[PDB]
Symmetry: D5
């Protein structure tokens, strides 16, 4: 029913993804992450759990070439279920892309600082803890 | 997880609902409706069916006082399931509000013209046909 | 090499196509068409023939659902080779879309007026005559 | 009579609260506090005492999840009545929120510097001395 | 405590009043009135009843020279108490101004149209019905 | 004749005075002072001597609560008449305000730097030398 | 003491005069004239009587070539002293310019409508009645 | 077919070239280069390989006086065919200009940093690796 | 000495010319013409007679393809020397363009109205009367 | 013919000169000088030699009070004829101003840095080398 072919329908998300170059980053975050004013805010949160973190990550990565992902170390202990789903998804993504997506971890404080350098933060409705990822653009 | 208490979390939706006065309109539309440039565009559409038309209508009407809804005539025959889900929702809403929500139908052509006068169009990921409603703000005195 | 998957790489074209609704129009024009200030100008012209009219039409239609195309009557006599190439392309596009693209003709003067209502005019490097088309967004339901 | 359900009716206050993330701050101030140009100015002051500092704090905290509050040390000695009323209110808020709101004190000079980092300063009509608080967003 | 001498403390209200010329209008409205986009929106509403319609009218008229007031005919029957309070206040204002303030009534529909031509609409927290007035600037 | 009651009639001056908080500064300057772009420019200068430095200082201080004033050292020797008229005015102002206005002096070079931090510079038509003052907002608690 | 040679010192007035072409108009008005938003507002009013209407007209006409002036008919009866001073000044101006300045009169209502088409309205501190003129740019 | 005489038809390119002074830089880049926000973005990329890096470099240099070019060292080993075509083109350009165009190499990391100081980056559709050049404006005088 | 090759050096002129399409107009005017706010203002006037009307017309027409020119009837009687110099110049221009430039006349009142529809007015320092021309973009095709 | 009396007819030049205070600078430059984006760009260049550097300096100084001028040391050897013309002009200007204009020299690299602090750079059509000057506003008291 959209006039745009494909599945990435949001106008802002389409626009920012089409502006990305190598090493530019894009953040997908949860309903409580602060968003620095040095970065564009794309607020997709409708209500609790809608859309979910994974729904957004999944849709964004259909159009974005990802070479790396950064996470808060706190996700491992405090949201292991979501951590594992994300890792599985990034594993499938890299296979589809024909590359290898590098995963790394920093403290959440440091994560928030890195968000200041992204091209945009896409806010989801996710309510679970530390459901935030920085995606880095890259191709082989 | 959010810093705003309640369930209407979107910043633009909150902002526009808080600016509404009596008889101001807000449109919730499907993935294919054109949006006139005389109106603000709030693009919630992520992908096909996410978020749905009903998810957006429901969330919006938790904060918005609704006195009327306008629909395309075309929805009756071409999307009867969604039509009846929306009518049921508006029926519950009016009860919770303590009023009676007036429903009307115009041609889709005329509907699109009315959208030019709204304060904003909130775009959903809905892909079914004629999944568009104009909500009118109002309360009992 | 581009960070966007697919083949529609231009940021402004991607942006306008993602904002299109049903019956919105998008114009692809040649190097000499005047562009009204009521419409956004996406200037893809690099130099004579680069990119060609057909390159731009082809790329735009890989993302945009097209239900109709409008052309100046003058193209039939004054640019028949390009006219046919475009018709063949629209024939294949409708097949891949699963619909039927309606083609219509107006005077060039009328065509220029219709461009004032489009969302954007994407300017190619094409130098042949009347190499301009208005594409209308639409899908079947 | 308003078209928005609830009691937080101001359009600008609604807007900024809806934009808050964890650790973002919002300031509620008196009629005399300077407002840095690195922050948004929401001027609610109508006239002396209208609306009061407490009326604004109260209304803001109906929508905002508060995890901490910062005050000038000067409030203790120079506006003890208002100091107490605020502490009692924050006590009731934390109970309603199911958390514990941390209170801390800085010099007024330092307080003014922290206001430079807030998302907005909401100016009240309060005329008593040092009737200024920085509220920090947070949940569990 | 404010740095501006007097009692009209709001920065936006001060600003618009200082821009008024003869026959320019300023609207003071209730919490439910729609505000046309051809006019500036000064949103003073904090919460239900704060500030009241009368508090705003009173404060605005301390700085503004008023020669006329326009009301919806609906106020007469549906908010007679507020109607009277306003007429008494306008009576005292004209005495203090040394002029005579003309009052007239239009349909609410027509009232809303006239608001499109005003310099600003100052929104109060008033919840009673038809608590809206158009004030017209003028002196002798 | 004006629609604003009182005697501070300028729209920009009214606007900026109403935005002032404690320790914010406002500068009233002469016809030749440079105005940094980090500060708002309110240009009241019509022609030589119109309005005068004192006319502007006087009007501004009818609405502004002043707790301090800063001057160039150079004003003492090079514009002593104006210096003493200003000191007299500040003396009356403090009495009417019920406080005590603190006066200080810096080099003109340093004065210009301090103007970079003010909320606005109100430019007068004054042509005498070093007819510039930084006024600091403040009241007694 | 100004860096600009000559006597027209205001930055906005200098700017608008330098943009004028033949038949463009510029209004000088009193402290109470409403100023339409279709026109630029240059607010020179400091306080009652400062600067005066004549001070502004006089300064503006040192840089502006004037071919015509329009006045409200009401000036003749209600501000004859100022009317005559203005006429005398326009008489001297035309002699200096080597042309003949055309004077015409319309109703004040019509005058206000004509102000909507000017390039700018320069507001003086004048408090006497109908102290408003539309100046038309022109040279022989 | 265009209203501008000559062969540099793009309005943004024409505009930026006409604002260049001596030592100003202009970047022509491939489809994958990040573009810093301290620089203007001129997005000519339509689709993969259209227009090519060389098409853009060639057209730009028909209006722009070039005194030097900077490349990433990585181009030597990872895009040698394109490297050579560019050097040949710069050789012919310097001859038609009557000067000598200086070529230098930096790491790609350092190249990206230099792009932050250019007046604009013109993005081509090129997909080969390290197809990025910083062109420096200058004339013999 | 400039970084742009050729002789049309102004950045705004270069910019506007590169955006012209067929039938777009560009005005070159004298020091006294009013410029409507519906049109871009390019102020080249430095002082009386610098640059002259003819200097501007000449430079503009080196980049701009002209198909027609409109003048005020008043130029015939009140600036005949300039009228003739312009016609001669348009005669030589059409020869170098290989077309025929149509000249027409309207009242000056009507001329001013047409200027409201141009893409820009380029103001020269010319002081002679009615030294104003509307140039229409076009090429033979 | 112009509606402004006097000889400084350009709207942007008039505007910037009227905003100058003591020690603010204004640059007049040649056709090749790069203009930093921290400064306003007033592009008076029409074509080679039009207007000349001296035309622009002369006109600017009819309105602007000048207390000092800064030049690149390179002008002495590489443009001695223009250097002398400028010095003679500054000699007459100071006489008519009743002051003494201080002239100083820096490296051209340093000159370019100083331009970043000016209020505006007014670009002439001058093609000779190092035809750039920084003028400093000031009057005697």
């Amino acid at each position: 029913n959209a006039m745009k072919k494909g599945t990435v329908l949001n106008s802002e998300i389409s626009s920012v993804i089409s502006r990305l170059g190598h090493t530019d980053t894009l953040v997908v975050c949860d309903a409580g992450l602060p968003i620095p004013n040095s970065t564009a805010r794309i607020d997709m949160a409708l209500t609790q759990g809608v859309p979910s973190f994974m729904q957004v990550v999944d849709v964004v990565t259909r159009e974005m070439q990802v070479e790396a992902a950064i996470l808060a170390t706190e996700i491992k202990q405090q949201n292991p279920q979501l951590h594992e789903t994300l890792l599985t998804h990034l594993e499938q993504l890299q296979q589809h892309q024909g590359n290898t997506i590098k995963i790394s971890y920093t403290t959440h404080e440091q994560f928030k600082k890195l968000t200041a350098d992204s091209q945009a933060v896409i806010r989801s409705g996710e309510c679970s803890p530390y459901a935030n990822v920085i995606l880095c653009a890259g191709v082989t």
